[PDB]
């Protein structure tokens, strides 16, 4: 009955700014104060400020105070917050919810879709898998596992194919790591000893983003 | 600012159980609490507010009670779909400030890690760098403690690992191995060594390998 | 003016359930509160006053309670013959205020809506003007969005529809469709489409007519 | 044990008064409050005001205070509101209802019979049906389906006859609706496909103000 | 002077469930209800003080409860003799004031009347009046209207009828009929009706006599 819409995820250079928008409906946009929270790595929440949408109220938190303002378009809807002087730790999926009428208390009930914005001065790079394969010439045990490797990749992220899609059972998936400003990828597949020799797999790793497909004969 | 502390930071239960978290608060509000469940890449929904009342479209197996500083928030009895993160609000004094978060997971027996190295291959030389993995694979709990033994000696900086989340049907994790190393220190020792102390065995096994292996 | 909120607004439940309705009012009153029942085409008729005494004739199946500001009224458990708004009240201060009201409808699996399209005849083009018509039937739940394409465009003012209320057997709802345009703008296009909007698919289904078919 | 009897629903162009009245028994009448709650669409209700019926009290909603008077007959028992210069959106439902002794708190035990009250200058006027037959030529699906339609009306309402009362299981009714100062009626029927080419339905509507019953043949 | 007023005035249940009577007094006392239990032809007994404590002999049954002013009695699960009239008093401000009485009755199933309709004889003439009886038997529940038509009018005062208490086993009333008019006036009209209209049928029946007869 309340649906909350924000921006598409933003990536930018270290000392510019950015600005995000925050559309609802379902409600009168003015009786209802709307809030803004940021989620860092892991699980850590903080509270950026509140807006009253009649002509302008604002709170901020003393420690955000500077490096974030609020400004809201009363006509068409919206919430739109803007960020000055990012920087490295400033990159966190942000939130925007409704309040309480006429308060700020009375904690938010609806959400938003949790827009990322990230921050980094790297440039973009076509990915280049790695080959992993056995071995030191005695294989153990039953069970023979291999996986995948990518470099050189930016900004997230990359998608993983077995076969075309033969199994998705024991493929697993893992985050990337952050290496000297760049990321990197890594695979298991558990498969027991009657493939190889005789039945051999392939790795196939593409990249959205840049439109790079490479495919490497494991 | 009042800060807020949630205990325990993991806690593991399987399904049908009753699981009681907490929160406090350094000052005593009296009037605020509000509890939230944001599933993995979602996000928060609220559960109980005022530290009482059931907000809508949450079932009745979710009661908070509490007064003063110390809250809490009791679950009878599980399900399968309310796993996840739990935080705690204030709506008292700005700033509004949250809890660390309280992971719920499903609980299962005891499983033995897959271990698994392997040595570097002869690609990556060309761009001047050398790096192996070690990966284990089907273990649990979560805890571990890695060790990488070349000649006796431990090596730091660049010894970091990676986690998968908790799986569905299997409900188990993985890890992942990545070292910054150049080509030219790859070849000045020999024995390497990936180490896991894990509580399925007293004695962590030992793999290890050589160059022209 | 103390002003009354209640959540939610409509609740769908089946029989059997427990059932939690909530009031709240702006300031503190502590000793007044009516919640009241109203079925279709009838008088109000009091269930709970002073937020936890139940009236005479009122079934022991209603429990009131609550303090302060935030009240609640509990239903356990639901009968077949309980379907029907309520009402909040104060007595505190003049004005004495009521809320929103909240629906309590019967709880029910999905069904596919009944797709009707019809073109208009010859009588109505005497009288100067021209009226076609879309039906839909047996659709569950109501919530649906109506959508005319006409070559590919939106007309407003002048589309609206109405519905009937729930059935007892049946329990399902129904639609109509009332378009006011005069007789010389009806020749003027061709294609017409009825489209709605449900859950039942991700795709609407899509049927149109033509002037000579 | 206490009945609340109120009069008939009436009807008056904008601009003129109306009176309604409000009879009771059952209880001492000079011992217990009433007041008057009106209820729009849909569901909403207001307090219009109370009455204390020893020699005269009274007390008026702040909005209300001017469109409305409480006036009480102690020797026969009833309750009289007057409205003045009335408009379209004043028309509603108005109810009556006891009070607490020597209290105006307390909440309403006893309701009336909620007698509403319409304001429009529009002129009644006889009711014309609308055909509905098929079609485009092929019918689909195995369902065939059809209705009624009801033009130039007024006021509420009609009643739906299929067949001198054949079928009552498929038929559906549907409220007015506002166009033009002109309101508007439909219907749908399910019925299979083995009624038409072969079995005939016909529609007949009667109008029990006007006194007007036309039959369609479908 | 505090005065009291109990809720319902008359309440029918059968045995087996559980009755909440009220009682309300116009000022707060916080400190005295006195709950009582007078079979018919009997003393009054004491069952509850104080508003919670009950008194010796009193069997567990009854549960009282209530603060401030609004109080209540709770009875579970009813019993066969516990069947009478309650009342509620005041130890507070001098008068103690009692309740106006709540009737407790067995709750039955739907039964007709018995319509009886006799002329007057011959030998009440000699004294210089008549008298004409109608009686009714075996009817529940206790509500009825008489109705009396001559020559299509009601005739007032002097119709007034007397009824029975509850039965044992049986457990109905009984109406009776005196009329007191003279001999002269008697002969004055012919038709003569006894009307009773009661909710087992939408049209009393007639039954009607004559002079000559």
């Known amino acids: 009955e309340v649906q909350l819409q924000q921006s598409g995820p933003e990536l930018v250079k270290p000392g510019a700014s950015v600005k995000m928008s925050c559309k609802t409906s379902?409600?009168?946009?003015?009786?209802?104060?709307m809030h803004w929270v940021r989620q860092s790595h892991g699980k850590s929440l903080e509270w950026i400020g509140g807006?009253?949408?009649?002509?302008?109220?604002?709170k901020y938190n003393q420690k955000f105070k500077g490096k974030a303002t609020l400004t809201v378009d009363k006509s068409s809807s919206t919430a739109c917050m803007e960020l000055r002087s990012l920087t490295s730790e400033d990159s966190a999926v942000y939130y925007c919810?409704?309040?309480?009428?006429?308060?700020?208390?009375?904690?938010?009930?609806?959400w938003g879709q949790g827009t990322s914005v990230t921050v980094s001065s790297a440039k973009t790079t076509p990915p280049s898998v790695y080959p992993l394969a056995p071995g030191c010439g005695d294989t153990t045990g039953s069970s023979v596992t291999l996986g995948c490797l990518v470099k050189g990749y930016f900004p997230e992220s990359v998608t993983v194919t077995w076969n075309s899609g033969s199994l998705s059972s024991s493929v697993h998936t893992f985050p990337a790591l952050l290496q000297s400003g760049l990321y990197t990828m890594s695979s298991s597949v558990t498969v027991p000893s009657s493939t190889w020799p005789s039945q051999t797999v392939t790795c196939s790793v593409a990249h959205p983003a840049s439109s790079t497909t490479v495919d490497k004969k494991l | 600012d009042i800060q807020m502390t949630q205990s325990p930071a993991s806690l593991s239960v399987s399904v049908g159980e009753t699981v009681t978290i907490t929160c406090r608060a350094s000052?005593?509000?009296?009037?605020?609490l509000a509890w939230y469940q944001q599933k993995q890449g979602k996000s928060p929904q609220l559960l109980v507010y005022?530290?009482?009342n059931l907000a809508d479209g949450v079932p009745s197996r979710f009661s908070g009670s509490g007064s003063g500083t110390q809250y809490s928030l009791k679950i009878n009895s599980l399900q399968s779909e309310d796993f996840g993160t739990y935080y705690c609000?204030?709506?008292?004094?700005?700033?509004?400030?949250f809890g660390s978060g309280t992971k719920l997971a499903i609980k299962r027996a005891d499983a033995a890690p897959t271990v698994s190295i392997f040595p570097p291959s002869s690609e990556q030389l060309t761009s001047g760098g050398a790096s192996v993995v070690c990966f284990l694979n089907n273990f649990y709990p979560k805890d571990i403690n890695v060790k990488w033994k070349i000649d006796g000696s431990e090596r730091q900086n660049g010894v970091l690992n990676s986690w998968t989340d908790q799986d569905s049907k299997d409900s188990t994790y993985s890890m992942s191995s990545t070292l910054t190393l150049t080509k030219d220190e790859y070849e000045r020792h020999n024995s390497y060594t990936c180490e896991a102390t894990h509580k399925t065995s007293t004695s962590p096994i030992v793999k290890s390998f050589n160059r022209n292996e | 003016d103390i002003q009354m909120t209640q959540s939610p607004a409509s609740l769908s439940v089946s029989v059997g359930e427990t059932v939690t309705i909530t009031c709240?009012?702006?300031?503190?009153?502590?000793?007044?509160?009516?919640?009241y029942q109203q079925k279709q085409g009838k008088s109000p008729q009091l269930?709970?006053?002073?937020?936890?005494?139940?009236?005479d004739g009122v079934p022991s199946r209603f429990s009131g309670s609550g303090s302060g500001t935030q009240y609640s009224l509990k239903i356990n458990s639901l009968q077949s013959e309980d379907f029907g708004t309520?009402?909040?009240?104060?007595?505190?201060?003049?004005?004495?205020?009521?809320?929103?009201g909240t629906k309590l409808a019967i709880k029910r699996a999905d069904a596919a809506p009944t797709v009707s399209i019809f073109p208009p005849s010859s009588e109505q083009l005497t009288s100067g003007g021209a009226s076609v018509v879309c039906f839909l039937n047996n659709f569950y739940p109501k919530d649906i969005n109506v959508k005319w394409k006409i070559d590919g465009s939106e007309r407003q003012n002048g589309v609206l529809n109405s519905w009937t209320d729930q059935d007892s057997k049946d329990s399902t709802y129904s639609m109509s469709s009332t378009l006011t345009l005069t007789k010389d703008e009806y020749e003027r296009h061709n294609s017409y489409t009825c489209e709605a909007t449900h859950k039942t698919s991700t795709s609407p289904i899509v049927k149109s007519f033509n002037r000579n078919e | 044990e206490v009945q609340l009897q109120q009069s008939g629903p009436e009807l008056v162009k904008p601009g003129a008064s109306v009176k309604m009245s409000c009879?009771?028994?059952?209880?001492?009448?000079?011992?217990?409050?009433?007041?008057?709650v009106r209820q729009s669409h849909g569901k909403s209700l207001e307090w219009?005001?109370?009455?204390?019926?020893?020699?005269?009290?009274?007390?008026?909603?702040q909005k209300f205070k001017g469109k409305a008077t409480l006036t009480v007959d102690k020797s026969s028992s009833t309750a009289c509101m007057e409205l003045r210069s009335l408009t379209s959106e004043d028309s509603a439902v108005?109810?009556?209802?006891?009070?607490?002794?020597?209290?105006?708190?307390?909440?309403?035990?006893?309701?009336?019979?909620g007698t509403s009250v319409t304001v429009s200058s529009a002129k009644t006027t006889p009711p014309s049906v609308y055909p509905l037959a098929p079609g485009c030529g092929d019918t689909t699906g195995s369902s065939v389906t059809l209705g009624c339609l009801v033009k130039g009306y007024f006021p509420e309402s009609v009643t739906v006859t299929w067949n001198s009362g054949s079928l009552s299981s498929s038929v559906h009714t549907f409220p007015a609706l506002l166009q033009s100062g002109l309101y508007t009626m439909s219907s749908s029927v399910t019925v299979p496909s083995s009624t038409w080419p072969s079995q005939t339905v016909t529609c007949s509507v009667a109008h029990p103000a006007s006194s007007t019953t036309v039959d369609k043949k479908l | 002077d505090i005065q009291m007023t109990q809720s319902p005035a008359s309440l029918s249940v059968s045995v087996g469930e559980t009755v909440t009577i009220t009682c309300?007094?116009?000022?707060?006392?916080?400190?005295?209800?006195?709950?009582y239990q007078q079979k018919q032809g009997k003393s009054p007994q004491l069952?509850?003080?104080?508003?919670?404590?009950?008194?010796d002999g009193v069997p567990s049954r009854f549960s009282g409860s209530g603060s401030g002013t609004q109080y209540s009695l709770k009875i579970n699960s009813l019993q066969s003799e516990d069947f009478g009239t309650?009342?509620?008093?005041?130890?507070?401000?001098?008068?103690?004031?009692?309740?106006?009485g709540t009737k407790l009755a067995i709750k039955r199933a739907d039964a007709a009347p018995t319509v009886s309709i006799f002329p007057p004889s011959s030998e009440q003439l000699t004294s210089g009046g008549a008298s004409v009886v109608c009686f009714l038997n075996n009817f529940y529940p206790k509500d009825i209207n008489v109705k009396w038509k001559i020559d299509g009018s009601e005739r007032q005062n002097g119709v007034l009828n007397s009824w029975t208490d509850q039965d044992s086993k049986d457990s109905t009333y009984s109406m009776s009929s005196t009329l007191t008019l003279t001999k002269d006036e008697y002969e004055r009209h012919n038709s003569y009706t006894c009307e009773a209209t009661h909710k087992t049928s939408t049209s009393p029946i007639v039954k009607s006599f004559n002079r000559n007869e």
């Open positions: 919810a409704r309040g309480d009428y006429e308060n700020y208390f009375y904690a938010m009930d609806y």
């Open positions: 379902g409600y009168t946009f003015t009786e209802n104060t």
């Open positions: 807006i009253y949408p009649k002509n302008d109220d604002t």
């Open positions: 000052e005593n509000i009296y009037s605020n």
């Open positions: 005022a530290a009482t």
């Open positions: 609000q204030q709506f008292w004094d700005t700033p509004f400030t």
